Amino acid sequence: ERYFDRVDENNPEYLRERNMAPDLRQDFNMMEQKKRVSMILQSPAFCEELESMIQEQFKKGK
Amino acid sequence: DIAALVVDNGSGMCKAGFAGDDAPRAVFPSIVGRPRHQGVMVGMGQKDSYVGDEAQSKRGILTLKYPIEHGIVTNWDDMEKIWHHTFYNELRVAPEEHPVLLTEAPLNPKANREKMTQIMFETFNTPAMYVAIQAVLSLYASGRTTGIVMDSGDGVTHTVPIYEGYALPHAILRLDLAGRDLTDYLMKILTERGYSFTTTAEREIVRDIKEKLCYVALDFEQEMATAASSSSLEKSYELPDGQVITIGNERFRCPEALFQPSFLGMESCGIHETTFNSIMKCDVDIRKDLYANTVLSGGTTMYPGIADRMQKEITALAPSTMKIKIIAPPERKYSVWIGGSILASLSTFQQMWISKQEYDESGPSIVHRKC
Amino acid sequence: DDDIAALVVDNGSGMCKAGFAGDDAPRAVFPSIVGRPRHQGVMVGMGQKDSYVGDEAQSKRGILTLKYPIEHGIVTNWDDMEKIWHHTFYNELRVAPEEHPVLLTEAPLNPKANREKMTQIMFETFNTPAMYVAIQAVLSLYASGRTTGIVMDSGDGVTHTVPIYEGYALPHAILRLDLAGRDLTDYLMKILTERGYSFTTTAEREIVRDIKEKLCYVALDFEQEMATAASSSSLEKSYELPDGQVITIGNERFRCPEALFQPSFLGMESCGIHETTFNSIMKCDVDIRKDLYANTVLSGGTTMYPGIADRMQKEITALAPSTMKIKIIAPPERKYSVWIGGSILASLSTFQQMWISKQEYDESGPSIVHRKCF
Amino acid sequence: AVPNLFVPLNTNPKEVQEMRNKIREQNLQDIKTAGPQS
Amino acid sequence: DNDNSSARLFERSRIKALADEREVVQKKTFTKWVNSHLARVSCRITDLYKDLRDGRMLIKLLEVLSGEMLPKPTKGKMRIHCLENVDKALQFLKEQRVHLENMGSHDIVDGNHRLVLGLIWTIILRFQ
Ligand SMILES: Nc1ncnc2c1ncn2[C@@H]1O[C@H](COP(=O)(O)OP(=O)(O)O)[C@@H](O)[C@H]1O
Numbered sequence A: 001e002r003y004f005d006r007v008d009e010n011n012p013e014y015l016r017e018r019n020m021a022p023d024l025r026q027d028f029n030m031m032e033q034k035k036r037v038s039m040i041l042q043s044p045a046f047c048e049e050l051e052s053m054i055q056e057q058f059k060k061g062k
Numbered sequence B: 001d002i003a004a005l006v007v008d009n010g011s012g013m014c015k016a017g018f019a020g021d022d023a024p025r026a027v028f029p030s031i032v033g034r035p036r037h038q039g040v041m042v043g044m045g046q047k048d049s050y051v052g053d054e055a056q057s058k059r060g061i062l063t064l065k066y067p068i069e070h071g072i073v074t075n076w077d078d079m080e081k082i083w084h085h086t087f088y089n090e091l092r093v094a095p096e097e098h099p100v101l102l103t104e105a106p107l108n109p110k111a112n113r114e115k116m117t118q119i120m121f122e123t124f125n126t127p128a129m130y131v132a133i134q135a136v137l138s139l140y141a142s143g144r145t146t147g148i149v150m151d152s153g154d155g156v157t158h159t160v161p162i163y164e165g166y167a168l169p170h171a172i173l174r175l176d177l178a179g180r181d182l183t184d185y186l187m188k189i190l191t192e193r194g195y196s197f198t199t200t201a202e203r204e205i206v207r208d209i210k211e212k213l214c215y216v217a218l219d220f221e222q223e224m225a226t227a228a229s230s231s232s233l234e235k236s237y238e239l240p241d242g243q244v245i246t247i248g249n250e251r252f253r254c255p256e257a258l259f260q261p262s263f264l265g266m267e268s269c270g271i272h273e274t275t276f277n278s279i280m281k282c283d284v285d286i287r288k289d290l291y292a293n294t295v296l297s298g299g300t301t302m303y304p305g306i307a308d309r310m311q312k313e314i315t316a317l318a319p320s321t322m323k324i325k326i327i328a329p330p331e332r333k334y335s336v337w338i339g340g341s342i343l344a345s346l347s348t349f350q351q352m353w354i355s356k357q358e359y360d361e362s363g364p365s366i367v368h369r370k371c
Numbered sequence C: 001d002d003d004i005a006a007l008v009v010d011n012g013s014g015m016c017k018a019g020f021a022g023d024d025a026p027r028a029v030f031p032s033i034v035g036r037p038r039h040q041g042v043m044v045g046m047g048q049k050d051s052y053v054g055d056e057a058q059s060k061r062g063i064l065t066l067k068y069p070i071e072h073g074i075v076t077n078w079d080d081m082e083k084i085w086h087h088t089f090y091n092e093l094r095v096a097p098e099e100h101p102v103l104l105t106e107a108p109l110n111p112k113a114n115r116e117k118m119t120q121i122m123f124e125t126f127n128t129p130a131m132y133v134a135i136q137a138v139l140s141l142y143a144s145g146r147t148t149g150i151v152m153d154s155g156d157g158v159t160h161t162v163p164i165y166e167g168y169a170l171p172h173a174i175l176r177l178d179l180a181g182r183d184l185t186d187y188l189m190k191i192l193t194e195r196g197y198s199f200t201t202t203a204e205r206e207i208v209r210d211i212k213e214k215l216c217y218v219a220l221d222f223e224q225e226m227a228t229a230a231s232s233s234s235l236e237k238s239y240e241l242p243d244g245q246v247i248t249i250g251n252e253r254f255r256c257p258e259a260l261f262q263p264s265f266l267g268m269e270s271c272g273i274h275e276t277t278f279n280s281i282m283k284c285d286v287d288i289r290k291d292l293y294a295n296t297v298l299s300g301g302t303t304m305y306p307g308i309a310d311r312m313q314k315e316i317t318a319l320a321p322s323t324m325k326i327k328i329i330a331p332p333e334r335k336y337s338v339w340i341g342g343s344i345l346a347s348l349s350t351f352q353q354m355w356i357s358k359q360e361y362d363e364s365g366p367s368i369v370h371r372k373c374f
Numbered sequence D: 001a002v003p004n005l006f007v008p009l010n011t012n013p014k015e016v017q018e019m020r021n022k023i024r025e026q027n028l029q030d031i032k033t034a035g036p037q038s
Numbered sequence E: 001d002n003d004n005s006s007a008r009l010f011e012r013s014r015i016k017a018l019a020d021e022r023e024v025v026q027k028k029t030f031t032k033w034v035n036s037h038l039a040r041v042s043c044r045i046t047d048l049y050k051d052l053r054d055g056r057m058l059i060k061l062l063e064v065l066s067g068e069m070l071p072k073p074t075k076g077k078m079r080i081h082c083l084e085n086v087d088k089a090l091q092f093l094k095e096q097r098v099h100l101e102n103m104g105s106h107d108i109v110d111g112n113h114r115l116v117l118g119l120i121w122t123i124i125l126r127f128q
């Protein structure tokens, strides 16, 4: 009995599994396979450049 | 651990997610549906209006309308409904506890930013909210600080060049040629095959057809000759009612309106010519980098063969000594949100947030002071 | 409120059913006929009875002429309808009409004067505190228990198809056909002539109806069954008349209900019931059709022929595209289904808001029924 | 307009199914009850 | 034939059972109500269906309830005199403008349960 093992209405964040489009099913898996947001933050050389660029663009204007 | 929220809005798609996450938590169309048929069944579930993913399920009994067209909102109440559904039903988080990050088109009227800020502080009691440019965030998601970016959504197409983290306001080019107009053109050219689609649900069906069975031709006349002289370029779509249609010749005809707007009769030039003109408006010294870094963004640029045709059309107008290359990330649909998820995560960005208390003495114009 | 239960009255052309809300089965089921004597009355002291109504009108049908107050779902004679309602309320249920509200059913596409006169009669004479009028095919979906589906209701007076998706009914896709078991009884009475049997009086029509209810079925293939009936005598069956005579129906058994699928046997230009259901499906929007294909619901006493569901499924499958899955839902209790739905509708706590009060009728005349109900 | 004129809005669909199931259950138990006393 | 058998099962079990329970309860209650008023004179009925056939007790009950003098019953023990005695009570009810529908003397004499119960119920609705 898999059907007794779990219930669709017990967990809403398991209920999200049923109502997915197939291309939406790939987009999440591929995008957390890539981990781009983790890559940008973990890599320093681009990171402090972005840091200081935002800070000193605030410094003179906007 | 209070974390910021990134909410990306575009005409036809709303995404939302916590800052610092790889994936947005919620993705759903920006649709509002109201019942059209006489509802007679006492005691069962009826509602005044359906919104989001639930509204798309019941397309048969609903009239579906979009609150945003061409990047400009038409009815603010529907926008409030979508924002409330995003904050409460999708993420189940209080809007007044976490800061929220918002995006918009670069060129837009004055009143949009002010009304958006007023609604976001007054209705939801957001402690801090910031407005950012979509295409700039897409370039940050690509991870280069320089280059010219092309973001083409379902509302409007725009190319902006960014050099050293600054987007030049004079060189920004905007063209009102989007995917919804392509859907209308595809419906008009499917009329002549014998299949007729008129209602809004049939427009969504035509949009799904366009997403599944469209591609960009490398040579337009040669592909017309091949499609006229043979039946190889024919695919069959299977309708939700069981009917089967043959898309046939039209597959490369609908996206080609992106390059030649004379099919739609628009006065403006093609998208590649728009990108070339935007590059021409910049200074000479940076033009090399503008020809060296070009990324594609938006769901409209997911047609197969868009990169090769774009590169060829840019190389045709470019000088012979210039080197042309086109960068197309596979996740170009959700690049903008990813950039937002970068921008809220920085340690220098906490001072960039708009203060709730400062808005009290400033007012709705405060964003024009700070952004 | 808790102990008081509104009366549920299903009022078709053939038979009338009545009971209390919250009950699984109706208390009183009896035919809707009004009979009057025609012969001499010579025995003095037997008493005078002007009219016979209901089941005991059937028992003494030998010396009576029988009239149907409802023809094609329309109340042609209203005095006989008052007789039937009085016999239902007092003799059958033994309830005072002032105590409980009344729930009534009717056909989808009917003249407005029928509804107005129903409201006027149930307020002015029986003096009811509240009353509601509903559609039978909508109540069939309540009895089925599903939100979406297409209901084909075939009674003694009229057949009609309504589609409902997610509790929303489409008025433009509702179809009405004047082809029911009444015309089938007339057709059987016509085709029994060629075997030598003649039934002409109104009393013999009930015998023909009993013969139809006992010895009729729907062939899955018409031409093959006709060839089988011509080749052999295994299809023949025997029936016994009330006077002891024996008749043999033989070939006619699958020819009487076949007029439902081919109306050209009756001279009608209309389409069959399967084509009517298919056309009602394709009159709806594109998206819901799949769901309307999966939840076809049969109802009414006319759909009690053996083998009706298999033939209907085969015809719909032949008409529909092959990639869709076609199933026909026919409960064994499909004769009473409408009434059950009425009880389910009558016992809801929400529906207590939707009753038509007597004060509203006093303010608005008999025209209040169109603004409420459906 | 007025598409929802004949029905009230914001009603739980579960209650109708529960009461239909109760009427269904009455048949299985087949408890015999008299009519309401006048 | 299987679904036909199931339908016959349903309309043999539930429709019969509910109606029989209701009519048994109504029979007991009507018997008590008639016995209360009929005890003023020295009269008592054990069965509602059987003792009301001859038509004498109906005349006695109507005489007790109404308060005036009905015509005395026809002196006989046949079926015709029985019909006459029931018809006298029915005609006296036709005086009081009480509305009776599908009610005849032979229906009471033969002993149809539903029509006798309806007659008693109509009398109760009038004379209470
Ligand atoms: N897989 C796909 N292939 C081709 N076109 C697509 C695909 N997915 C979406 N589109 C087109 O892109 C549009 C959605 O663009 P989107 O990225 O949502 O714009 P925005 O987010 O700026 O509103 C749709 O109208 C559709 O026509």
Ligand SMILES: Nc1ncnc2c1ncn2[C@@H]1O[C@H](COP(=O)(O)OP(=O)(O)O)[C@@H](O)[C@H]1O
Binding pocket: C011, C012, C013, C014, C015, C016, C154, C155, C156, C157, C181, C182, C184, C185, C209, C212, C213, C300, C301, C302, C303, C304, C305, C335
């Ligand atoms: N067991 C049966 N088999 C076949 N046909 C039947 C059966 N019972 C009834 N019918 C047909 O149905 C008719 C009665 O239908 P009914 O359910 O009374 O309709 P309504 O209640 O809507 O008036 C009869 O005239 C007869 O033609």
